[PDB]
Each structure stands twice: as structure tokens, then as C-alpha cells.
Symmetry: D2
Subunit: 202 residues, 4 copies
């Protein structure tokens, strides 16, 4: 079974970019539920898999992907954020900084691309910076709902995720998702992104 991980900073530490009220609900309620529902779906899967019940194994895939994906994505999300005073918003250095310049022209090129993609997500979803381990390239992509980046390709590793579910910004920014996407860059932990990039693992 899985447990809700602690945040590496206080709930209020990403303000003003993200309010403490959102961080608290987002962590303790939304992420907590994915964890608990993933644990439950896993218990059922284990039974079905052991019993040779193919139909129930397939039936369980919706719940497994959604809550397991939910757990994966938010565990990553919390780690690719950091307070402005602790490195949040500081541009990536080294190879990732370079690779980003090579693939997107500049950090602002990437920020614009990911901001555009995030604003255009229909309904609930995520925008990602990823590393394609196969082709050795950085990619930008979105996933729907709680689908994790690896569902877009087995060789992809997420470096940065930005949650564009309404629960990620609505208490603070209401309908204005572009303002949320404008500000979130202030607390993006590019150090985290760099380490994942350097190791090719989260």
C-alpha cells in the first residue's frame, strides 16, 4: 500500500503564487483520496489477478489508472515546486538548462509553450515537460485527467508537471487559468527537474 507523502515545504510557502488554502486542500483532500482509492483498487486487483478473473482485472483499469495516476502525478508535482526563497523560480543550470535552450530556444520559449498548452487543456488535465529516454529529447505534452506522462510513451520521464485541474487554482484565480499559469513559474523547482533529467528517474 501507499501513503500520502509530506510536502517538502509548508502549505503557505509558495505564496503569493499559490495560496496556502489551495495547497492544504490539494494535498490533504485531493491527493489523499487518490492514495486511498488506489490502495483499494489495488486490493481488488490483487484478488482478481490471483483468482484469474480477467473481466474484473480489465474493469479495474479505469480506477487503477485514475487513482494510481493521481498518486504519481501529484507526488511529482509537489517535488517540482519550491518556495521562491529556496530556489523556486531559479532557472535550470547545467545540461537541462542547455537542453531546454537547444529544444525550445530559451527558458521563455518553453514557458510560453507550456503556458499555451496548459491554457488550452479541455477539462481536467496536466501539462508536462518530459525527457524521451529513447530519442534523447525533451518534449512538451499534456495528459487528460490523472493520466500520467508515461501513458503518452513508455520511454518518457516527467521533469516538470503543472496541474491544470480547476481545483489547482480555482479558489485563488477562479476562472482565470492563464493568470495561474503566469504565476506558477515563480515556484517551479528547476533543481528537481535537473536531477530527474541527470538521472532519468523521478
Amino acid at each position: 500500500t501507499f501513503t500520502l507523502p509530506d510536502l517538502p515545504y509548508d502549505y503557505g510557502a509558495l505564496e503569493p503564487a499559490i495560496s496556502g488554502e489551495i495547497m492544504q486542500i490539494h494535498h490533504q483532500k485531493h491527493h489523499q483520496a487518490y492514495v486511498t482509492n488506489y490502495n483499494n483498487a489495488l486490493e481488488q486487483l490483487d484478488q482478481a489477478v490471483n483468482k484469474g478473473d480477467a473481466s474484473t482485472v480489465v474493469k479495474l483499469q479505469s480506477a487503477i489508472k485514475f487513482n494510481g495516476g493521481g498518486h504519481v502525478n501529484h507526488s511529482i508535482f509537489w517535488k517540482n515546486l519550491a518556495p521562491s526563497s529556496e530556489g523556486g523560480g531559479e532557472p535550470p543550470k547545467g545540461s537541462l538548462g542547455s537542453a531546454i535552450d537547444a529544444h525550445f530556444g530559451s527558458l521563455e520559449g518553453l514557458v510560453k509553450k507550456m503556458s499555451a498548452e496548459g491554457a488550452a487543456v479541455q477539462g481536467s488535465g496536466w501539462v508536462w515537460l518530459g525527457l524521451d529516454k529513447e530519442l534523447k529529447k525533451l518534449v512538451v505534452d499534456t495528459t487528460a485527467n490523472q493520466d500520467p506522462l508515461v501513458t503518452k510513451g513508455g520511454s518518457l520521464v516527467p521533469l516538470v508537471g503543472i496541474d491544470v485541474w480547476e481545483h489547482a487554482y480555482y479558489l485563488q484565480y477562479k476562472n482565470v487559468r492563464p493568470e495561474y499559469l503566469k504565476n506558477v513559474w515563480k515556484v517551479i523547482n528547476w533543481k528537481y527537474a535537473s536531477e530527474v533529467y541527470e538521472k532519468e528517474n523521478n
Copy 2:
């Protein structure tokens, strides 16, 4: 072609309280629906252009924006009409043929309510739960759609009778993460008179 406009609500913004806050009604109408309306108009202008120029690729590329914003407009226009203040019939059970049909298909009104609540609660991400009429069989269905897909994308002979918006902007300011509490209270302001009338004429 025709441009579309934001329809007026049939009641004041605060009229659905306490079930749905006036703050939610106002933003939902003036910001979310309006954006679907305006982005639908813009998509139509490009579509009209692409169709006239014989640009098949752009016609098809535009289907995403057309379905999302056209869908958004359809769905919210219905949503506003299938809500009503409690003092004007909101939350009063359906009478006549729809009431009969509901008892026939779902056992009872509460059976239907249980079903739609369960379905709405289980919607992953953004979407809608619907009570619909299949015009072919003259039968009732409950179904969900993702994002702003309207019920007609699940079958061309379907007519939506009642929609419940389960996008987070439909409830988050008031109920936060607790969608089931929203789904518990939304039934107080469901306009079953609208659903009955739609059922009766089948559109």
C-alpha cells in the same frame, strides 16, 4: 451564419441558494458560459472560412474547438433552464408522463436520483451527468459525458432532459472537494417542470 449570444438566466444569480451560491452562478454564467459562447462564434467564423475555401484539413482540425465550445454553449444553456428556485418549482418531483416513465425505468424518483448522483460522483475529471430521452425507443437513459461533449454525441436520437454540471467550477467555491455534497443539494433546485415539458414534445 449566425453568431450566438449569452442567454439570460430565468432567475436572479442568488435565487438557487442555499443549494448553489450566487457567487458560483454569477461566475459560471458571466465568465465560463460566455467564454464558450464567444469561442464558439470564433470557431464558426474560421469553420465557415475553411469550408468555403475547401480546406478539409482545417475543417477537421477545428472540430475540437467546435465540439468543446459549441458543446459548452448547448450544455450550459440547458443547465440554466433545468434549474429553478425552490419557491418556483425547483426540487418538486416530475408529474404526468415523465413521472410515470421515471418510475417505469428506475423504480422511483429516488432510484433515479441515487443513480445520477452515483454517476456524477464517479465522473473522472470534468463532465456532465444526464437524464436523457432516446427518441427512437421513447425511453429514458442516464449517461455521462466528458468535458463539454453534449449528450447528442453519445447517440443522435438522444434529447437531454436534465443535466448536472460536475465540472469543479460548478461547485468548488461552495463545496470545495466534496462533490457528493454538491450532488446531494443540487436536487433541491432541479427544475423537473422543464424536464417534463421536454419529455412531452421530445426536444
Copy 3:
């Protein structure tokens, strides 16, 4: 966990002629269904490993292959059983309660046949058309699924009674592009006896 095997057909490869050629039954069974079974078994081995190692990302990455090959196995196992040679009851109308429910829900057996045929003809790409039982409401439904998604992915309380495969490999060698002709003839060998039993037993 359990391994799965290709089930035997309840009749000879050629027994469904003229509606479905033996060449199709053979390749469809020995090659297509067999691949789903084997790829389902391989995905389960990786799933079991991932689940045991606490690897959420791999469990979720594997859901595509699990649903596709697991669904493929489920769907084809049902499909073989809801066909029968005309001389063994294939094409004979449902009796008992199902016949009644069909009359109640669709007007007549032909109302139903027209509906499933229209739905099958209209399937974009690969998929299935179903007569299903909603166990909660004790009601009949007609629905389609894409690729190898089983009916149970449309609602956990659904039980498939009759499936018609409208993947091109179910008909192409015999009917080529004319899927409606396939859908005209397949009704000669629909095993409504299986459907009744399932209906009666849920």
C-alpha cells in the same frame, strides 16, 4: 497469478458457414484471439512484478496493454460462445424471459436486430456492438465499445449477452469493405440460447 489459455470453439472452424467462412474462424481464433491471450499473460507477469515492487508508474503504464489484451480475451471468449451453427440453434430467436425483455425494450426481435446492425455499421474504426444486461436496473442495453474494451468498461454492472465483432478481421476476407452485408448474415448464427442463459443467470 493465473495464466490463461486459448479456449476451444464449441463447433468446428467451418461450422458457421455460409455466414462466416471457416478461413475467417480459423485465423480469427488461432492467430488473433491467441495473441490477446499471450499478450495478456505477458502483461500480467509485468503487472504482478510492478504491483509487488510498489511501482505505481509501471502499474499505470501497463493498463493500456492490460485492457487491450485482457479485453480482447474476454470479448472473443464471449463471442465464440454467442455463435452457433444454424443446425445447433444458431439464428433461432430467444425464448423465455429474454425474448420478453427484448420485446419490452426494443419492440420486437427485429427492432433489436435493426438497432445493433445500425450501431455496428456506424462504428468508426475497430470495435464491438453489444446487447448487454444492466444488472442494477435489470434492464437491456445496446452499446458499442472501441477496439477491445469490454462492455464492463461502460458500467460495472453490465453483463454482455451478445457481442458482434466489427473489427475488419472479423469479416474482411469474406465480405471485404461491405460490413453491412456481414452484419446482415451474422444473425443466422447468433446463439440466442447462450444469451438467454446468461440473461437468466446474470
Copy 4:
């Protein structure tokens, strides 16, 4: 309205890679149907758009995308194929050849990648070599059913498509889609791809 385009070679000219029988049905029946139904859907679309019928405009989106996409994808397909004796299968020269080496290591790299993606398509679809006009990069991607590559990104332009619908190989290769995908490369028209790349239009 649209009309069925002539092929740039005889039905049998792509043998042995693709049989003349497939080419003939694929062109005259499958593509013809997409053209005719697109024409019908556009007429209905035109009425609904003129009448201000939002609900019907959206209902027609499924038919517009499938049949419109079908016309687009197959119109391209015919042009990015050519007889081996007339330039089919000759590696791309000039900028596209360079770009392929830059992005995929080698033409064989690209071929392996696209073949792998094609084999893994679940149900009906396409594998594409595309040009991202925004990022100025080559990409490989798949689409489902008749979705054209532009539904994956508004700035994408397809250079090469390979149809992996079963009707594209089944009469000849039956279930062995990997053998179809192995041979199709002998008749890929890389000169067409180059022209598109050089001008950024089909």
C-alpha cells in the same frame, strides 16, 4: 464538394509490397466512401451552421472528423507512396534526409521507430512522420481511426503516413501487420515527403 482523386500510378504498380487488389478496394471503396460521406456531412453542416442550430453542428463533428479525416489521410497516403522503379523506397536527399539523421540518428532509426509505433497501434489508425512548424522539428506520432495528424497539434504537417487499418494489409498479409510494415518501406515516396518538408504544405 470533394471528389475521389486519381492515383499517381496504376493499382498494381506498388507490387510486391502492396497487392493491386488491396489498392483497388482501398481507393475505390474505402476512400470513395469517406469522400461521399464527407460531402453529405458538409451539406448538413452547412445547413445547421446557417440555421444557428448549435446542437446539430456539434452532433455532426463525429462524421466531419471521420470522413473529412479519411479524405485527408488517404489523399496524402496515395502521394507518399510510389513504385520502387519510380523512386519509391529511395532514401530522402537534401534537407529532409539531413533532418531525419539529426532527429532519429539515421533513416533506419526512423524506419524502426515508425514500424514499432505502427505495430503497437490498438485497433485502427495511422503512423505519421510529421514536421512541427512551431518547434521546427520532425516528429513521429500515431492517430486513431481517421484522425488526421493536425488533431495532434495545429502546427504539425504530415510528411509520411502509413495506414495500419486492417483493410490496408489484410487481403495480402492477414494478421501479420509487422510483415506489411516491413515491406511498405520499399514503396514510400520520399521525394513527396521532401517536397512537403521544403514547402511545409501537402
